């Protein structure tokens, strides 16, 4: 759950939101799903710009949630727990989706917006992985900027079966359209060059 520090800090960052943001969860009856429901609930009462709804009908991992805008189905998705060292990645995702500008250069943002082609990214991370945030943040921003670019950040502690199934030996582990894309540290600029 959100610890006092996280909650207070989250309340502070969410003042930066300028547009309404929706957290759309897809849950099952598991205990992990209850944790996510309780977390998204706490996040939503920290700001009047954030609404927590669920649609447990979508063919996606459970539990997981979409970060988007009302009347939209575009945005990054977190499957499993978004805390640990990914708390910052969550914060940024909510900010960006809420109108707060990325700190990146404008021409890079544009190159991302102009990427042609459809890409479905999946990034496995662990809550204690210190080098996972930057990769998760890079791919989240790209999904916020280009609707043709999708990203699901997967907590390997909630989807353990996928870790051995795909033979993930370390994190972050990134896949694109079902195939291995890269592992370990990578910058946004290095990622855009590979897919551009």
């Amino acid at each position: 759950m959100l610890d006092t520090n996280m909650k207070t800090q989250l309340r502070a960052y969410l003042e930066k939101l300028t547009k309404p943001v929706e957290l759309i969860a897809t849950l099952d009856d598991s205990a992990k799903s209850a944790e996510i429901k309780e977390l998204l609930a706490e996040i939503a009462e920290l700001s009047d710009k954030v609404t927590f709804k669920e649609d447990n009908t979508l063919p996606v991992r459970k539990p997981s949630f979409l970060i988007t805008n009302p009347g939209s189905q575009q945005g990054p998705r977190f499957a499993g727990s978004p805390l640990g060292h990914e708390f910052t990645s969550l914060v940024l995702a909510l900010l960006w989706t809420g109108g707060h500008p990325s700190k990146e250069a404008q021409s890079l943002l544009e190159q991302i917006r102009d990427i042609d082609g459809d890409f479905e990214f999946e990034t496995y991370y662990s809550l204690s992985c210190h080098n996972c945030p930057d990769v998760v943040q890079a791919l989240n921003l790209m999904a916020v900027l280009n609707p043709r670019i999708k990203h699901t950040a997967i907590d390997g502690g909630t989807f353990q079966n996928e870790i051995t199934e795909r033979n993930v030996m370390g994190v972050p582990a990134v896949f694109v359209n079902g195939k291995e894309f890269g592992q370990g540290r990578m910058t946004l600029t290095e990622i855009v060059a590979k897919v551009d």
Side-chain angles (χ1 to χ4, degrees):
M1 48 160 22
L2 283 185
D3 66 33
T4 313
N5 189 68
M6 297 180 131
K7 184 163 73 164
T8 310
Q9 189 158 296
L10 188 47
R11 198 188 308 122
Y13 286 114
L14 299 188
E15 286 175 27
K16 303 289 185 190
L17 301 183
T18 64
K19 308 130 56 89
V21 166
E22 302 192 321
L23 311 178
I24 306 179
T26 296
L27 311 177
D28 63 8
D29 289 331
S30 86
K32 219 76 176 187
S33 273
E35 299 187 10
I36 305 302
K37 178 265 181 182
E38 292 288 77
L39 169 71
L40 304 185
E42 285 186 49
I43 298 176
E45 41 181 275
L46 290 193
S47 174
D48 59 271
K49 298 276 206 306
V50 180
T51 304
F52 168 28
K53 294 187 297 174
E54 56 197 278
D55 185 341
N56 316 314
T57 232
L58 299 177
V60 298
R61 297 176 175 85
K62 291 180 194 178
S64 76
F65 63 92
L66 173 62
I67 297 168
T68 185
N69 298 113
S72 186
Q73 287 293 297
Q74 168 185 354
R77 164 175 305 275
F78 278 86
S81 168
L83 303 187
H85 289 153
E86 292 305 319
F87 173 66
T88 305
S89 301
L90 170 70
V91 166
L92 295 173
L94 289 153
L95 281 178
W96 300 332
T97 304
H100 194 242
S102 132
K103 296 177 72 70
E104 308 279 345
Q106 185 63 203
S107 45
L108 176 56
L109 294 188
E110 287 190 343
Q111 190 191 343
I112 292 159
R113 297 189 190 100
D114 303 317
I115 281 173
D116 286 316
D118 302 292
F119 304 88
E120 206 184 15
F121 285 97
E122 292 173 289
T123 298
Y124 294 93
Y125 63 78
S126 64
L127 272 18
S128 62
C129 168
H130 195 281
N131 300 177
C132 291
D134 293 347
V135 173
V136 164
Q137 289 170 28
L139 290 181
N140 280 353
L141 174 58
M142 296 173 75
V144 168
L145 303 173
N146 186 327
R148 307 262 296 286
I149 297 185
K150 284 88 178 297
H151 184 226
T152 301
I154 309 144
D155 156 28
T158 301
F159 298 88
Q160 292 133 296
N161 56 298
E162 289 187 36
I163 296 304
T164 83
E165 258 152 47
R166 297 207 190 175
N167 203 207
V168 183
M169 290 297 258
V171 293
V174 185
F175 295 69
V176 74
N177 303 327
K179 309 202 75 178
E180 288 170 1
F181 176 85
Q183 184 180 301
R185 287 166 78 267
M186 23 179 114
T187 63
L188 174 59
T189 298
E190 300 174 337
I191 297 166
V192 173
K194 280 178 57 62
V195 61
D196 196 8

